[PDB]
Design an enzyme around this catalytic site. Structure first.
Site, PDB file in Angstrom:
ATOM      1  N   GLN D  11       0.911  -1.386   0.219  1.00 37.96           N
ATOM      2  CA  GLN D  11      -0.130  -0.013   0.105  1.00 37.96           C
ATOM      3  C   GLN D  11       0.851   1.211   0.114  1.00 37.96           C
ATOM      4  OE1 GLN D  11      -2.739   2.179   3.254  1.00 37.96           O
ATOM      5  NE2 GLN D  11      -3.136   0.166   2.740  1.00 37.96           N
ATOM      6  N   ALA D  12       1.971   1.371   0.935  1.00 39.39           N
ATOM      7  CA  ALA D  12       2.621   2.581   1.088  1.00 39.39           C
ATOM      8  C   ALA D  12       3.421   2.856  -0.391  1.00 39.39           C
ATOM      9  CB  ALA D  12       3.635   2.338   2.241  1.00 39.39           C
ATOM     10  N   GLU D 183       5.067  -4.272  13.514  1.00 37.82           N
ATOM     11  CA  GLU D 183       5.979  -3.678  12.671  1.00 37.82           C
ATOM     12  C   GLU D 183       7.598  -3.791  13.038  1.00 37.82           C
ATOM     13  OE1 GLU D 183       3.677   0.045  12.211  1.00 37.82           O
ATOM     14  OE2 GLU D 183       3.978  -0.014  10.016  1.00 37.82           O
ATOM     15  N   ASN D 206       7.943   8.103   8.794  1.00 32.65           N
ATOM     16  CA  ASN D 206       6.636   8.971   9.032  1.00 32.65           C
ATOM     17  C   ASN D 206       6.553   9.720  10.046  1.00 32.65           C
ATOM     18  OD1 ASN D 206       5.460   7.734   6.746  1.00 32.65           O
ATOM     19  ND2 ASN D 206       4.172   6.393   7.569  1.00 32.65           N
ATOM     20  N   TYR D 224      -2.576  10.329   4.705  1.00 30.78           N
ATOM     21  CA  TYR D 224      -1.455   9.837   3.729  1.00 30.78           C
ATOM     22  C   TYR D 224      -1.457  10.615   2.470  1.00 30.78           C
ATOM     23  CZ  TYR D 224      -0.847   5.663   6.338  1.00 30.78           C
ATOM     24  OH  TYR D 224      -0.769   4.668   7.468  1.00 30.78           O
ATOM     25  N   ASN D 228       1.963  11.844   1.267  1.00 27.45           N
ATOM     26  CA  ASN D 228       2.614  11.395   0.051  1.00 27.45           C
ATOM     27  C   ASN D 228       3.264  12.686  -0.824  1.00 27.45           C
ATOM     28  OD1 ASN D 228       2.464   8.841   0.915  1.00 27.45           O
ATOM     29  ND2 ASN D 228       0.510   8.441   0.052  1.00 27.45           N
ATOM     30  N   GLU D 254      25.818   5.991 -10.133  1.00 24.57           N
ATOM     31  CA  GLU D 254      26.695   7.135  -9.285  1.00 24.57           C
ATOM     32  C   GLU D 254      25.997   7.333  -7.670  1.00 24.57           C
ATOM     33  OE1 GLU D 254      27.179   9.827 -12.190  1.00 24.57           O
ATOM     34  OE2 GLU D 254      28.381  11.293 -11.249  1.00 24.57           O
TER      35      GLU D 254
HETATM   36  N1  LIG Z   1       4.225   7.526   4.167  1.00 16.77           N
HETATM   37  C1  LIG Z   1       3.208   6.778   4.210  1.00 16.77           C
HETATM   38  N2  LIG Z   1       3.111   5.532   4.883  1.00 16.77           N
HETATM   39  C2  LIG Z   1       2.206   4.491   4.555  1.00 16.77           C
HETATM   40  C3  LIG Z   1       1.276   4.774   3.417  1.00 16.77           C
HETATM   41  N3  LIG Z   1       0.434   3.877   3.732  1.00 16.77           N
HETATM   42  C4  LIG Z   1       0.817   3.045   4.616  1.00 16.77           C
HETATM   43  N4  LIG Z   1       1.761   3.558   5.014  1.00 16.77           N
HETATM   44  C5  LIG Z   1       2.771   2.828   6.329  1.00 16.77           C
HETATM   45  O1  LIG Z   1       2.730   1.426   6.029  1.00 16.77           O
HETATM   46  C6  LIG Z   1       2.883   0.780   7.131  1.00 16.77           C
HETATM   47  C7  LIG Z   1       1.752  -0.524   7.048  1.00 16.77           C
HETATM   48  O2  LIG Z   1       2.530  -1.039   5.790  1.00 16.77           O
HETATM   49  P1  LIG Z   1       1.383  -1.442   4.438  1.00 16.77           P
HETATM   50  O3  LIG Z   1       1.973  -0.596   3.340  1.00 16.77           O
HETATM   51  O4  LIG Z   1      -0.021  -0.468   4.868  1.00 16.77           O
HETATM   52  O5  LIG Z   1       1.193  -2.916   4.368  1.00 16.77           O
HETATM   53  P2  LIG Z   1       1.359  -3.608   2.883  1.00 16.77           P
HETATM   54  O6  LIG Z   1       2.488  -3.136   2.085  1.00 16.77           O
HETATM   55  O7  LIG Z   1       0.049  -3.151   2.382  1.00 16.77           O
HETATM   56  O8  LIG Z   1       1.144  -5.191   3.338  1.00 16.77           O
HETATM   57  P3  LIG Z   1       0.075  -5.819   3.913  1.00 16.77           P
HETATM   58  O9  LIG Z   1       0.270  -6.142   5.453  1.00 16.77           O
HETATM   59  O10 LIG Z   1      -0.123  -7.070   3.378  1.00 16.77           O
HETATM   60  O11 LIG Z   1      -1.371  -5.001   3.799  1.00 16.77           O
HETATM   61  C8  LIG Z   1       2.373   1.516   8.251  1.00 16.77           C
HETATM   62  O12 LIG Z   1       3.321   1.798   9.399  1.00 16.77           O
HETATM   63  C9  LIG Z   1       1.643   2.677   7.640  1.00 16.77           C
HETATM   64  O13 LIG Z   1       1.937   3.803   8.453  1.00 16.77           O
HETATM   65  C10 LIG Z   1       1.225   5.641   2.721  1.00 16.77           C
HETATM   66  O14 LIG Z   1       0.474   5.997   1.922  1.00 16.77           O
HETATM   67  N5  LIG Z   1       2.276   6.779   3.146  1.00 16.77           N
HETATM   68 MG   LIG Z   2      -2.055  -3.606   2.577  1.00 13.94          MG
END
Ligand SMILES: Nc1nc2c(ncn2[C@@H]2O[C@H](COP(=O)(O)OP(=O)(O)OP(=O)(O)O)[C@@H](O)[C@H]2O)c(=O)[nH]1
Ligand SMILES: [Mg+2]
Ligand SMILES: Nc1ncnc2c1ncn2[C@@H]1O[C@H](COP(=O)(O)OP(=O)(O)CP(=O)(O)O)[C@@H](O)[C@H]1O
Ligand SMILES: Nc1nc2c(ncn2[C@@H]2O[C@H](COP(=O)(O)OP(=O)(O)O)[C@@H](O)[C@H]2O)c(=O)[nH]1
Ligand SMILES: O=C(COC(F)F)N1CCCC2(CC2)C1
Ligand SMILES: [Ca+2]
Ligand SMILES: [Ca+2]
Ligand SMILES: [Ca+2]
Ligand SMILES: [Mg+2]
Ligand SMILES: [Mg+2]
EC number: 3.6.5.-
Lengths: 348, 425, 54, 438
Positions: D11-12, D183, D206, D224, D228, D254
């Site tokens: 997601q991130a 985490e 974050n 977010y 972002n 580089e």
């Molecule tokens: N900066 C930023 N952090 C994010 C964002 N989305 C999620 N996070 C961070 O990502 C962490 C959780 O990871 P996710 O990306 O939600 O998990 P995932 O990669 O989708 O993997 P799954 O567990 O299968 O859902 C948390 O600490 C969130 O704060 C985003 O859009 N921007």
């Molecule tokens: Mg996810």
């Protein structure tokens, strides 16, 4: 409800501060490993600064400035003074010093010998003191051979051969000044200083007996035979020492000694402010310092060392400890005078 | 499309589950005939988590009604929203269970269980990606308790890698039907310890004391108790039925609430709980102070007797989310002696813009507290008071059970208590 | 205080400033690790079904 | 011209990727439909922007990006978002059920079944490259996909592309914007199995982005989208050299040369300024020396730490806007005389400087105000080890009780992989202290 943790059970000082905090009925002590704290009375060595200021919604405050060790170390201070332009190598209130690493390990051995030989040829007093287990001697061969016997870094500096002696007694002494620096980097000096006086007559023809030369409270209380004669616990406070300076020397402690002490404290602390300031930091720092000064027969003040975890005089624990809660802790965590400090204003 | 299959078993199971679907159906705009009439697309965003979509835009709950006697389910079908449930999803017998765990689990129940799995399989086969199941039942009866846990055991066999969640009503002598409730409760607890990922413990004594002392109900009824469970069930499932920056599926919630496989029993809580001074606006500090207060806890356990392993609070309604974080961080940082220090940041918070019907804002509390051991301690003591004299054992031995099986349940729960004890120091 | 390697183009430029001179797992090895955990899952699930069969 | 294939995992990564390519388009003058009026060579060309964009005969400019998530909700936004037309459906890969914040789930259980499909889709982008430089992998530490599936993709990329470089943009876990308690486990697991496969990794905490949004942008509770839109500003500053004419950081190699003298210590700290709230009627524009001075304020660092108590191993100043070399050197001089910038005796005490005259592009309706000049400092300090310390400590508190370990073991992971991962971080923290402390 403010919360704090304790991680230095030996700190006689903050042991009292922690005692006063709970007395206010508004500070709750947590386990030393409980990261949800407001105030950390942290350990001396290897304090985890990197773990501070990362708890959501907690304004965290600690009792040690990260990086102040540059000033509270024998070798670090010598390097700081010789290299810092604000203090320069020609600093007139710090005895000539040299960093001397033991040969079994930069090093200023040759730089030291050059000045030594110069003094020997110049008929001038060539008595130095090595420390880091202290040795006083006038032969350079003995000072270096002692450091080599050890394994840690030592510092050789000029031994003040004309120290001011208190009469009656003809005895050496040093002056301890407690200095508190809060989070905003104000420099507050405790109005109460102590003189740890030697109860033995100062003898200049025998540095072997380090009893009349080392004014340490433990040496005078262990290897001295006149301990507690002229003043209780070989500790003369500012009131008495001031009256003496007037009766004998016709001067005040303020004009003859305190101005220089207040000037030395400023120059040292301001020099490192950009390195340890917590102005734009994710956590806040404050610390209590113990400055040790020497006074010569010309009423000139010299800086011996700075203590980072200093103890207080038995008579001044209540006053200073509470004062550490007023301007250091309560200034960041207030509770629902005639200050006992002297603000040393400066440019930030 | 992360569908949840709902199952309600027995009298308590079906009366509570009835009010549950009544509550959320209203929150999603589903009228008693399945037609949608809401006004916010947020109502339909995750509507398919608990409902299927028939032809003509009809939404049918994904629920399976189970009971060994027709009485209770007949009422539901004639109740407020009885017409909304799928007719095939009614699976019932005629003998009844007689508040006998052995009858629900071994004799009567065993005869009807295969046909319930036939409907479960049929609901699952229609799911794009089944999250898991959720069962609502009591533990002191015979059907919800004895046959419910038999259903879980067989559902976990055919779906070994799906989440199994239960709303479990715990018996209490103060709110009792029969003296054998500790027997049935102790037998079910060991089944849940093994075959559920999350069990929401709901003590009937807590529900009763809340109605008498807090809600000021002179003479509480089972209906009165079911109001609280309905509101609570709607609260815990808010992070599931509506959109939010959470992305919380059943397995994600389990991964962050259950640090150990056997200690998966939770204490729910709700706020407000006002008596009819009911229009007054409730501030965020008030919502928080109450949500963590024990008098708002529905497990009849004092959290100040143990430590929280994890905590999850959901806030509903338009309110300063900033102010929310402030009060939550004030609760933790004011009573950090009750949260374990070896699970960093074990208190999480979610917000929801859609409040429950008739409340400008509320807060639902979900806590994995070691204080829950006091509950199992109660059941264990009441169990041993009778079992040492073998009182009422004939009901069970007559159904095919042996005393050895009782001794094992006894120990298997005392172990559970012991496990909660070590993690409390 | 020195500037070295000053490169200029239409959209910008880049340079250096010296203030002071100084003083894998093969594809097979990954398939095994992946399958190793898959086997530990199947064994764990077997013991679950064996438990339920009892 | 050499191509750069961006990969977004979880997601991130997917949402950050969405925010960056939105910015790349605004910067390079690409419209949502993939059309680029200024590109006079239609359906081809070896320009600096072609390192990130390919071209169809119809004049469409298609990102060289792959989006991967074990759950389709996040990537479905790209399919029907503003730039839905930029990508073709092959570029967006989605699964059925995610990893539930379980590293073992994204790496083993679920990753084993989808790994060969992702590589296949990437191979389709490689086949459009005449000289593929490497990959830019955006992911999070805390997510089960971002942490668990990333480390598996990295191992396989090192096998299928042995000579290609791999940079990372990693999201450090911050409680204020997270609901996951496990985490710390995931982060230490993914850093262990990824360390020897990533040549350079920019960590964004974050917690840092969160405060920069509350402090500079006056956002009481940033979302977010806010976090972002700001991260894609930093990422833009770090990828601009690859997308524009220039001579500093012209290829992914580089980055390892100018920033990573030691292989394992491949985590440069990033500092950015100025970040000005657009809601401010009008802001007094900062000078070259003031924005350069900000590069040493802990406030605008992507990871909150005290660089003063470390040793720099390298240092890049990336300027955008109205900046000439004269001003830069002037500010540097004054900063050396006032700041505590201790370098390692085995590294030059110097700064590489890059200047692009196009000031930072601001997303219409975003939070950041248009500034005339901005800078991004990429410095490799031992102070970033503070981040590893915080994380390793939280790992130790839970692992001492084996809390939540049953979830990982249940998905096929061995408990030994925990301590093996932890022992590596114990080594990583040691390599940092040997290089900085005396
Ligand atoms: N900066 C930023 N952090 C994010 C964002 N989305 C999620 N996070 C961070 O990502 C962490 C959780 O990871 P996710 O990306 O939600 O998990 P995932 O990669 O989708 O993997 P799954 O567990 O299968 O859902 C948390 O600490 C969130 O704060 C985003 O859009 N921007
Ligand atoms: Mg996810
Ligand atoms: N250069 C010098 N000239 C004169 N006296 C000196 C001196 N260096 C040390 N001393 C004597 O030694 C004492 C201070 O010793 P020092 O402070 O170096 O050891 P220490 O740090 O273990 C004691 P403290 O508790 O004050 O820190 C003073 O009383 C002083 O009389
Ligand atoms: N909260 C609540 N509890 C109930 C209700 N009905 C029964 N119970 C409790 O459930 C237990 C009886 O189980 P029951 O469901 O009636 O037996 P079953 O139909 O065979 O499963 C007793 O402890 C009752 O206190 C109800 O409507 N609400
Ligand atoms: O089987 C039991 C035992 O119930 C007990 F375990 F609680 N019944 C109760 C008495 C009436 C009944 C038909 C025979 C059902
Ligand atoms: Ca029959
Ligand atoms: Ca072209
Ligand atoms: Ca490699
Ligand atoms: Mg000392
Ligand atoms: Mg009944």
């Amino acid at each position: 409800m403010y919360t704090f943790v304790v991680r230095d059970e030996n700190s006689s000082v903050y042991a009292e501060v922690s005692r006063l905090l709970l007395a206010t009925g508004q500070w709750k002590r947590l386990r030393k490993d409980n990261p949800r704290f407001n105030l950390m009375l942290g350990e001396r060595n290897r304090l985890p600064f990197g773990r501070l200021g990362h708890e959501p919604g907690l304004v965290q405050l600690v009792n040690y400035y990260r990086g102040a060790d540059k000033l509270c170390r024998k070798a670090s201070l010598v390097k700081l003074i010789k290299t810092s332009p604000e203090l320069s190598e020609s600093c007139t209130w710090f005895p000539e010093s040299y960093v001397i690493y033991p040969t079994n390990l930069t090093d200023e051995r040759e730089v030291f010998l050059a000045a030594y030989n110069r003094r020997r040829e110049g008929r001038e007093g060539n008595v130095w003191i090595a420390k880091s287990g202290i040795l006083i001697s006038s032969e350079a061969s003995e000072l270096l051979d002692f450091i080599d016997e050890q394994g840690q870094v030592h510092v050789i500096q000029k031994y003040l051969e004309k120290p001011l002696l208190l009469e009656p007694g003809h005895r050496k002494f040093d002056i301890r000044s407690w200095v508190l620096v809060d989070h905003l980097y104000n420099i507050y000096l405790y109005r109460e200083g102590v003189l740890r006086t030697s109860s033995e007559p100062y003898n200049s023809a025998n540095f072997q007996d380090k009893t009349c030369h080392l004014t340490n409270h433990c040496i005078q209380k262990e290897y001295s035979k006149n301990y507690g004669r002229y003043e209780e616990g070989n500790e003369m406070f500012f009131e008495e020492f001031n009256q003496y300076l007037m009766d004998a020397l016709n001067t005040t402690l303020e004009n003859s000694i305190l101005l220089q002490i207040k000037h030395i404290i400023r120059s040292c602390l301001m020099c490192i402010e950009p390195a340890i300031s917590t102005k734009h930091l994710h956590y806040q720092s404050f610390q209590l310092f113990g400055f040790d000064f020497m006074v010569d027969e010309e009423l000139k003040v010299w800086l011996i060392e700075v203590n980072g975890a200093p103890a207080c005089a038995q008579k001044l624990y209540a006053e200073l400890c509470q004062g550490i809660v007023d301007v250091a802790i309560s200034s960041v965590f207030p509770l629902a005078p005639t200050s006992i400090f002297i603000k040393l204003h400066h440019h930030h | 499309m992360r569908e949840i299959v709902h199952i309600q078993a027995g009298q308590c199971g079906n009366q509570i589950g009835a009010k549950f679907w009544e509550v959320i159906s209203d929150e999603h705009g589903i009228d008693p005939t399945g037609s949608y009439h809401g006004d916010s697309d947020l109502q339909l965003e995750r509507i398919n988590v608990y409902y299927n979509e028939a032809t003509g835009n009809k939404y049918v709950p994904r629920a399976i009604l189970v009971d060994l006697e027709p009485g209770t389910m007949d009422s539901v079908r004639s109740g407020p929203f009885g017409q909304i449930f799928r007719p095939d999803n009614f699976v019932f017998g005629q003998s009844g269970a007689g508040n006998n765990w052995a009858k629900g689990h071994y004799t009567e129940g065993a005869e009807l269980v295969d046909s319930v799995l036939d409907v479960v399989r049929k609901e699952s086969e229609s799911c794009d990606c089944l999250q898991g199941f959720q069962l609502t039942h009591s533990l002191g009866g015979g059907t919800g308790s004895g046959m419910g846990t038999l259903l879980i055991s067989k559902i976990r066999e055919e779906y070994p890698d799906r989440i199994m969640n239960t709303f479990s009503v715990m018996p209490s002598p103060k709110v009792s039907d029969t003296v054998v409730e500790p027997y049935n409760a102790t037998l079910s607890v060991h089944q849940l310890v093994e075959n559920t990922d999350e069990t929401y413990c709901i003590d009937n004594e807590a529900l009763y004391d809340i109605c008498f002392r807090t809600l000021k109900l002179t003479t509480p009824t089972y209906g009165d108790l079911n109001h609280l469970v309905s509101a609570t069930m709607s609260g815990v499932t808010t992070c599931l039925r509506f959109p939010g920056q959470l992305n919380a599926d059943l397995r994600k919630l389990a991964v962050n609430m259950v640090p150990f496989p056997r200690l998966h029993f939770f204490m729910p809580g709700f706020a407000p709980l006002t008596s009819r001074q009911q229009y007054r606006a409730l501030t965020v500090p008030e919502l928080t102070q109450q949500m963590f207060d024990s008098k708002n806890m529905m497990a009849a356990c004092d959290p100040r007797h143990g430590r929280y392993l994890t905590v999850a609070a959901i806030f509903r309604g338009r309110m300063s989310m900033k102010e929310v974080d402030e009060q939550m961080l004030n609760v933790q940082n004011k009573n950090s002696s009750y949260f374990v220090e070896w699970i960093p940041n074990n208190v999480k918070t979610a917000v929801c813009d859609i409040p429950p019907r008739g409340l400008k804002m509320s807060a639902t509390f979900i806590g994995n507290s070691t204080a829950i051991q006091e509950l199992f301690k109660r059941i264990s003591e009441q169990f041993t008071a009778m079992f040492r004299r073998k009182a009422f054992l004939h009901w069970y031995t007559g159904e095919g059970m042996d005393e050895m099986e009782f001794t094992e349940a006894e120990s298997n729960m005392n172990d559970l208590v012991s496990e909660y004890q070590q993690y409390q120091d | 205080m020195e500037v070295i390697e000053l490169n200029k183009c239409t959209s910008g430029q880049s340079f250096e400033v010296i203030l002071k001179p100084p003083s894998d797992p093969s594809l097979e090895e990954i398939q095994k690790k992946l399958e190793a955990a898959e086997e530990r899952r199947k064994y764990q699930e077997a013991e679950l079904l064996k438990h339920l069969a009892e | 011209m050499r191509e750069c294939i961006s990969i977004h995992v979880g997601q991130a990564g997917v949402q950050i990727g969405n925010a960056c390519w939105e910015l790349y388009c605004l910067e390079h003058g690409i419209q949502p439909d993939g059309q680029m009026p200024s590109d006079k060579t239609i359906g081809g060309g070896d320009d600096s922007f072609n390192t990130f964009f390919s071209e169809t005969g119809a004049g469409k400019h298609v990102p060289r990006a792959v989006f991967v998530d074990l759950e389709p909700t996040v990537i479905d936004e790209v399919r029907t978002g503003t730039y839905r037309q930029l990508f073709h459906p092959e570029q967006l890969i989605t699964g059925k059920e995610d990893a539930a914040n379980n590293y073992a789930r994204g790496h083993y259980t679920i990753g084993k079944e989808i790994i060969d499909l992702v590589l296949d889709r990437i191979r389709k982008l490689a086949d459009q490259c005449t000289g593929l430089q490497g990959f830019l992998v955006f992911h999070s530490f805390g997510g089960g996909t971002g942490s668990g599936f990333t480390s598996l993709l990295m191992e396989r990329l090192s096998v299928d592309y042995g000579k290609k470089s791999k940079l990372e943009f990693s999201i450090y876990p911050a409680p204020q914007v997270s609901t996951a308690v496990v985490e710390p486990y995931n982060s230490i697991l993914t850093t262990h199995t990824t360390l020897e496969h990533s040549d350079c990794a920019f960590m964004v905490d974050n917690e840092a982005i969160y405060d920069i949004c509350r402090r500079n942008l006056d956002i009481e509770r940033p979302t977010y989208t806010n976090l972002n839109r700001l991260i894609s500003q930093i990422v833009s500053s770090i990828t601009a050299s690859l997308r524009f004419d220039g001579a500093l950081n012209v290829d992914l190699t580089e980055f390892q040369t100018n920033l990573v003298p030691y292989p394992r210590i491949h985590f440069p700290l990033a500092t950015y300024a100025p970040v000005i709230s657009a809601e401010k009627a009008y802001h007094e524009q900062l000078s070259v020396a003031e924005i350069t001075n900000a590069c040493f304020e802990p406030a605008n660092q992507m990871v909150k730490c005290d660089p003063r108590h470390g040793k720099y191993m390298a240092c890049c100043l990336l300027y955008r806007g109205d900046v000439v070399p004269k001003d830069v050197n002037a500010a540097i001089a004054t900063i050396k005389t006032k700041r505590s910038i201790q370098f390692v005796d085995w590294c030059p005490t110097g700064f590489k400087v890059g200047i692009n005259y196009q000031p930072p592009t601001v997303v219409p309706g975003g939070d950041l105000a248009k500034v005339q000049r901005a800078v991004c400092m990429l410095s490799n300090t031992t102070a970033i080890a503070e981040a590893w310390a915080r994380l390793d400590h939280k790992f130790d508190l839970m692992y001492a009780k084996r809390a939540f370990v049953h979830w990982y073991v249940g998905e096929g992971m061995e408990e030994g992989e925990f301590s093996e991962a932890r022992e590596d971080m114990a080594a990583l923290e040691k390599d940092y202290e040997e290089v900085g402390v005396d």
